[PDB]
Amino acid sequence: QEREVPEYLNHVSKRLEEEGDRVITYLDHSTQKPLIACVEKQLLGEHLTAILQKGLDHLLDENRVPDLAQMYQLFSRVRGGQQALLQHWSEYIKTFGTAIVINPEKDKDMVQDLLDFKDKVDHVIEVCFQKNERFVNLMKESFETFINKRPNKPAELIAKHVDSKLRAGNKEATDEELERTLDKIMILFRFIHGKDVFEAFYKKDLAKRLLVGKSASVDAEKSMLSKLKHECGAAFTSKLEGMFKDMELSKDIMVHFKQHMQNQSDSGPIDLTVNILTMGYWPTYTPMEVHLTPEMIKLQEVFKAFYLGKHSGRKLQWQTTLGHAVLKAEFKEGKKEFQVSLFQTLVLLMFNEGDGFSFEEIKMATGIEDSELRRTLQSLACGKARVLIKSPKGKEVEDGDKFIFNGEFKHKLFRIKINQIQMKETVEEQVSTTERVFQDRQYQIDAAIVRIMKMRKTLGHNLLVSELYNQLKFPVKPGDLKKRIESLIDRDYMERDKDNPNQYHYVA
Amino acid sequence: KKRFEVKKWNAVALWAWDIVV
């Protein structure tokens, strides 16, 4: 009640260490153990909360690994002080994890902080708790109890950060670290719940990663398929391996077509490339109304011709906007090459035939929807206008864009890769990619509950929730439980047993 | 020949079903 909690802890440490040698020289061994028992009651006995809540969490936040190990000793010797240690420090885990994801204004940085708290608690176990396992039990319990509460802020932020770690830079060439931080991804986000939204978003992420730019490594994606195969269903990693098999099918079609133009001897500059896919293992894509230069339409018909062979049973529903393409660009003061997107490639295709178009037939002769075309003009316009030049300036954009293509263009590099768009995405794009999972759980829980009542006739709702939580990779809301109860009654697999929702039957 | 001379068009797309449900 005079010194600080760490000061009193060091005093207790040294004063207990005093009482040994008193016996060692002169006092009695058989009263050494009564002496330490009494003294430890006098110092540490009956003070296992006012030392062990604040002065625990205070010196954990200060993270003095010496005194944390000191109190670990000083409360692993004592009568039961490690129980107070486990409870106070585990509540400390829950709250000091909870100081991340419940913050809706602070979603720009969540994943790195989660990694940080994971790292800190791991280090406090491995030295400050000296690889005891009770602490690990409280850790995992506390983490899962925490993240059952917010499922679909983290898994989406986590998916974006997983994709961010799946980028090809010049800074990283040791994928061993990215293997190790990938191991931390798997282990740490096994605490994070709602993995179906992460799963579908990772379909979106491999789409946005292959379709523009290039991935961090081949073995990185292979290791992720093998790792995410674990901890989820074995029919939950059928689509991803289907992605890479469909990519190999498209490459084999590429080899076949290149061999079939080996005797036609292409020397022309105009290229067509379609990597074709099936809708069972990929993100779904529906064509949107867009306008294509008629030679591209000729290439579409060529694509039909080479499409109709090789496992016929095939019928066109083409996409002609989702790729990125390399293009040479005429300007004054040099001819450099652009790596750009099809939304912008059509823009640049019209800025060959003339300079002087306006947003009316830029809206029309592209055909591009408003949501895509605004963000198309947020790249290389709404700033840095030396290729396209848009009459509204700044973040605010009005419907009056007047364009005259610029002769002037300056940069110090070749292969001018100015392409945010397809390695970016919009808010309602994310929201819609979430709703394609929201009322997609419907058939999942439908199948699960029809199988349950086909297995056990009576099951209260507080047990249906637990069987579903056992079975599924995401947490099911109480609203969705009412939703499936009512729809099962609509399709005659439930009857309310005893005229209340307490129990049910499988009678129609 | 043009203000962008066409060197590469590349696309990703889906091959679709053709059997009755």
Short mmCIF file of N, CA and C in Angstrom, two decimals, chain A residues 370-451:
data_model
loop_
_atom_site.label_atom_id
_atom_site.label_comp_id
_atom_site.label_asym_id
_atom_site.label_seq_id
_atom_site.Cartn_x
_atom_site.Cartn_y
_atom_site.Cartn_z
N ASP A 370 -23.18 3.64 -65.47
CA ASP A 370 -22.72 4.85 -64.80
C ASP A 370 -21.70 4.53 -63.71
N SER A 371 -21.96 3.46 -62.94
CA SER A 371 -21.09 3.10 -61.82
C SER A 371 -19.70 2.71 -62.29
N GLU A 372 -19.61 2.02 -63.43
CA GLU A 372 -18.31 1.66 -63.97
C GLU A 372 -17.62 2.87 -64.61
N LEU A 373 -18.35 3.67 -65.38
CA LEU A 373 -17.73 4.72 -66.17
C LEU A 373 -17.24 5.89 -65.33
N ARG A 374 -17.94 6.23 -64.23
CA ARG A 374 -17.44 7.24 -63.30
C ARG A 374 -16.07 6.86 -62.76
N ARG A 375 -15.94 5.63 -62.27
CA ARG A 375 -14.68 5.17 -61.70
C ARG A 375 -13.63 4.93 -62.78
N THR A 376 -14.07 4.64 -64.01
CA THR A 376 -13.17 4.62 -65.15
C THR A 376 -12.57 5.99 -65.37
N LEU A 377 -13.38 7.03 -65.21
CA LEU A 377 -12.86 8.39 -65.30
C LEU A 377 -12.31 8.90 -63.98
N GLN A 378 -12.29 8.08 -62.94
CA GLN A 378 -11.52 8.40 -61.75
C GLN A 378 -10.08 7.93 -61.88
N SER A 379 -9.76 7.19 -62.94
CA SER A 379 -8.41 6.77 -63.27
C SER A 379 -7.94 7.58 -64.46
N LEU A 380 -6.83 8.32 -64.28
CA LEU A 380 -6.13 9.12 -65.28
C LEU A 380 -6.95 10.36 -65.63
N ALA A 381 -8.03 10.54 -64.88
CA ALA A 381 -8.86 11.74 -64.83
C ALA A 381 -9.37 11.79 -63.40
N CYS A 382 -9.98 12.93 -63.04
CA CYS A 382 -10.13 13.39 -61.66
C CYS A 382 -8.73 13.57 -61.09
N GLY A 383 -7.83 14.15 -61.89
CA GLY A 383 -6.45 14.31 -61.48
C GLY A 383 -5.49 13.61 -62.40
N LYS A 384 -4.30 14.19 -62.58
CA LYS A 384 -3.20 13.64 -63.35
C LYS A 384 -3.63 13.54 -64.81
N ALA A 385 -4.34 14.57 -65.27
CA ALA A 385 -4.94 14.59 -66.59
C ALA A 385 -3.91 15.00 -67.64
N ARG A 386 -3.27 14.02 -68.27
CA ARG A 386 -2.31 14.29 -69.33
C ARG A 386 -2.53 13.27 -70.44
N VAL A 387 -3.53 12.41 -70.27
CA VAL A 387 -3.93 11.48 -71.31
C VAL A 387 -5.37 11.79 -71.65
N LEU A 388 -6.25 11.55 -70.69
CA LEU A 388 -7.62 12.04 -70.72
C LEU A 388 -7.69 13.31 -69.88
N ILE A 389 -8.60 14.20 -70.26
CA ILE A 389 -8.76 15.46 -69.53
C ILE A 389 -10.25 15.73 -69.39
N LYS A 390 -10.71 15.80 -68.15
CA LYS A 390 -12.13 15.79 -67.81
C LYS A 390 -12.49 17.13 -67.19
N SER A 391 -13.56 17.75 -67.70
CA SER A 391 -13.85 19.15 -67.37
C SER A 391 -14.14 19.39 -65.89
N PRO A 392 -14.94 18.59 -65.17
CA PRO A 392 -14.90 18.66 -63.71
C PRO A 392 -13.54 18.25 -63.18
N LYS A 393 -13.08 18.96 -62.16
CA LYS A 393 -11.77 18.72 -61.57
C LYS A 393 -11.96 18.36 -60.11
N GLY A 394 -11.15 17.44 -59.62
CA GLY A 394 -11.21 17.05 -58.23
C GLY A 394 -12.05 15.81 -58.01
N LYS A 395 -12.34 15.57 -56.73
CA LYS A 395 -13.18 14.45 -56.35
C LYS A 395 -14.59 14.59 -56.93
N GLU A 396 -15.16 15.79 -56.88
CA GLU A 396 -16.51 16.00 -57.42
C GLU A 396 -16.50 15.92 -58.94
N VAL A 397 -17.45 15.16 -59.49
CA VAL A 397 -17.59 14.96 -60.93
C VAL A 397 -19.02 15.28 -61.32
N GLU A 398 -19.18 16.07 -62.38
CA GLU A 398 -20.48 16.39 -62.95
C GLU A 398 -20.59 15.73 -64.31
N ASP A 399 -21.81 15.75 -64.86
CA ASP A 399 -22.16 14.96 -66.04
C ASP A 399 -21.68 15.61 -67.35
N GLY A 400 -20.86 16.66 -67.28
CA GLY A 400 -20.47 17.44 -68.43
C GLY A 400 -19.05 17.28 -68.91
N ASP A 401 -18.49 16.07 -68.89
CA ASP A 401 -17.10 15.87 -69.27
C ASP A 401 -16.89 16.18 -70.75
N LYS A 402 -15.93 17.07 -71.02
CA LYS A 402 -15.59 17.46 -72.38
C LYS A 402 -14.16 17.02 -72.61
N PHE A 403 -13.95 16.18 -73.61
CA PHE A 403 -12.64 15.59 -73.85
C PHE A 403 -12.04 16.03 -75.17
N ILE A 404 -10.76 16.37 -75.11
CA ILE A 404 -9.87 16.48 -76.26
C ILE A 404 -8.60 15.75 -75.87
N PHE A 405 -8.28 14.68 -76.60
CA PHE A 405 -7.13 13.85 -76.25
C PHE A 405 -5.84 14.65 -76.38
N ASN A 406 -4.95 14.46 -75.41
CA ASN A 406 -3.76 15.30 -75.26
C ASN A 406 -2.59 14.77 -76.08
N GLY A 407 -1.92 15.68 -76.79
CA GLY A 407 -0.69 15.30 -77.47
C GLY A 407 0.46 15.17 -76.49
N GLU A 408 0.44 15.95 -75.42
CA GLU A 408 1.51 15.98 -74.44
C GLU A 408 1.34 14.89 -73.38
N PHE A 409 2.47 14.33 -72.96
CA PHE A 409 2.51 13.20 -72.04
C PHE A 409 3.94 12.99 -71.54
N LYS A 410 4.18 13.07 -70.23
CA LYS A 410 5.54 12.93 -69.72
C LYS A 410 5.58 11.97 -68.53
N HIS A 411 6.65 11.16 -68.51
CA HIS A 411 6.99 10.05 -67.60
C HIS A 411 8.41 9.57 -67.88
N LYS A 412 9.04 8.91 -66.91
CA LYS A 412 10.43 8.49 -67.04
C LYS A 412 10.56 7.00 -67.32
N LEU A 413 9.45 6.31 -67.59
CA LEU A 413 9.43 4.86 -67.69
C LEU A 413 8.72 4.43 -68.97
N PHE A 414 9.02 3.22 -69.41
CA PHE A 414 8.22 2.51 -70.40
C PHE A 414 7.36 1.48 -69.69
N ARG A 415 6.35 0.98 -70.42
CA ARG A 415 5.28 0.15 -69.87
C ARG A 415 4.55 0.93 -68.79
N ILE A 416 3.87 2.01 -69.19
CA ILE A 416 3.16 2.87 -68.25
C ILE A 416 1.94 2.13 -67.72
N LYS A 417 2.06 1.59 -66.51
CA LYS A 417 0.99 0.81 -65.92
C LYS A 417 0.25 1.74 -64.97
N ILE A 418 -0.79 2.38 -65.48
CA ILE A 418 -1.71 3.17 -64.68
C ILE A 418 -3.04 2.44 -64.77
N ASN A 419 -3.28 1.55 -63.81
CA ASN A 419 -4.49 0.73 -63.79
C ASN A 419 -4.89 0.39 -62.34
N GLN A 420 -5.61 1.32 -61.73
CA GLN A 420 -6.13 1.08 -60.39
C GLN A 420 -7.35 0.18 -60.43
N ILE A 421 -8.20 0.36 -61.45
CA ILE A 421 -9.63 0.05 -61.37
C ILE A 421 -9.87 -1.41 -61.03
N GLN A 422 -9.26 -2.30 -61.80
CA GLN A 422 -9.55 -3.72 -61.67
C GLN A 422 -8.78 -4.35 -60.51
N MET A 423 -7.74 -3.68 -60.03
CA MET A 423 -7.12 -4.01 -58.76
C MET A 423 -7.68 -3.14 -57.64
N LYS A 424 -8.76 -2.42 -57.92
CA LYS A 424 -9.62 -1.78 -56.93
C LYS A 424 -11.02 -2.38 -57.04
N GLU A 425 -11.93 -1.90 -56.19
CA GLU A 425 -13.34 -2.27 -56.24
C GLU A 425 -14.15 -1.20 -55.51
N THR A 426 -15.46 -1.20 -55.76
CA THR A 426 -16.37 -0.20 -55.19
C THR A 426 -17.15 -0.77 -54.01
N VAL A 427 -17.78 0.14 -53.26
CA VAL A 427 -18.45 -0.20 -52.01
C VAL A 427 -19.64 -1.13 -52.27
N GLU A 428 -20.47 -0.79 -53.25
CA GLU A 428 -21.64 -1.62 -53.51
C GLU A 428 -21.28 -2.89 -54.26
N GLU A 429 -20.12 -2.91 -54.92
CA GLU A 429 -19.57 -4.16 -55.44
C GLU A 429 -19.27 -5.13 -54.31
N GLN A 430 -18.65 -4.64 -53.23
CA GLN A 430 -18.38 -5.45 -52.06
C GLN A 430 -19.67 -5.88 -51.38
N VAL A 431 -20.62 -4.94 -51.28
CA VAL A 431 -21.89 -5.21 -50.61
C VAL A 431 -22.66 -6.29 -51.36
N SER A 432 -22.71 -6.18 -52.70
CA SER A 432 -23.40 -7.17 -53.52
C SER A 432 -22.69 -8.52 -53.50
N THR A 433 -21.35 -8.52 -53.47
CA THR A 433 -20.61 -9.77 -53.35
C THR A 433 -20.82 -10.39 -51.97
N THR A 434 -21.26 -9.59 -51.00
CA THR A 434 -21.70 -10.14 -49.73
C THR A 434 -23.13 -10.68 -49.80
N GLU A 435 -24.06 -9.95 -50.45
CA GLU A 435 -25.42 -10.49 -50.54
C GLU A 435 -25.51 -11.73 -51.42
N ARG A 436 -24.54 -11.96 -52.31
CA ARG A 436 -24.56 -13.26 -52.99
C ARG A 436 -24.15 -14.40 -52.07
N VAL A 437 -23.79 -14.09 -50.83
CA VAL A 437 -23.62 -15.07 -49.78
C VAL A 437 -24.75 -15.00 -48.75
N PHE A 438 -25.35 -13.81 -48.56
CA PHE A 438 -26.40 -13.60 -47.56
C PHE A 438 -27.59 -14.53 -47.78
N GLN A 439 -28.29 -14.37 -48.89
CA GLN A 439 -29.36 -15.32 -49.21
C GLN A 439 -28.85 -16.41 -50.15
N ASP A 440 -27.70 -16.94 -49.77
CA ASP A 440 -27.11 -18.15 -50.31
C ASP A 440 -26.99 -19.21 -49.25
N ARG A 441 -26.96 -18.80 -47.99
CA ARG A 441 -27.01 -19.67 -46.83
C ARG A 441 -28.37 -20.34 -46.69
N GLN A 442 -29.36 -19.89 -47.46
CA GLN A 442 -30.73 -20.37 -47.34
C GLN A 442 -30.82 -21.86 -47.62
N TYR A 443 -30.26 -22.30 -48.75
CA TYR A 443 -30.28 -23.71 -49.09
C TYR A 443 -29.36 -24.52 -48.18
N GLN A 444 -28.29 -23.89 -47.68
CA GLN A 444 -27.39 -24.54 -46.73
C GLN A 444 -28.14 -24.95 -45.47
N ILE A 445 -28.80 -23.97 -44.83
CA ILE A 445 -29.52 -24.24 -43.59
C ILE A 445 -30.79 -25.05 -43.84
N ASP A 446 -31.39 -24.90 -45.03
CA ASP A 446 -32.51 -25.75 -45.42
C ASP A 446 -32.10 -27.22 -45.42
N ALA A 447 -30.99 -27.54 -46.10
CA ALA A 447 -30.50 -28.91 -46.14
C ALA A 447 -30.13 -29.41 -44.75
N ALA A 448 -29.47 -28.56 -43.95
CA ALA A 448 -29.04 -28.98 -42.62
C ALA A 448 -30.22 -29.30 -41.72
N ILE A 449 -31.27 -28.47 -41.73
CA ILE A 449 -32.39 -28.72 -40.83
C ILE A 449 -33.28 -29.85 -41.34
N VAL A 450 -33.44 -30.00 -42.66
CA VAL A 450 -34.21 -31.16 -43.14
C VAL A 450 -33.48 -32.45 -42.80
N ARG A 451 -32.14 -32.44 -42.85
CA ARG A 451 -31.40 -33.64 -42.45
C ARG A 451 -31.50 -33.87 -40.95
#
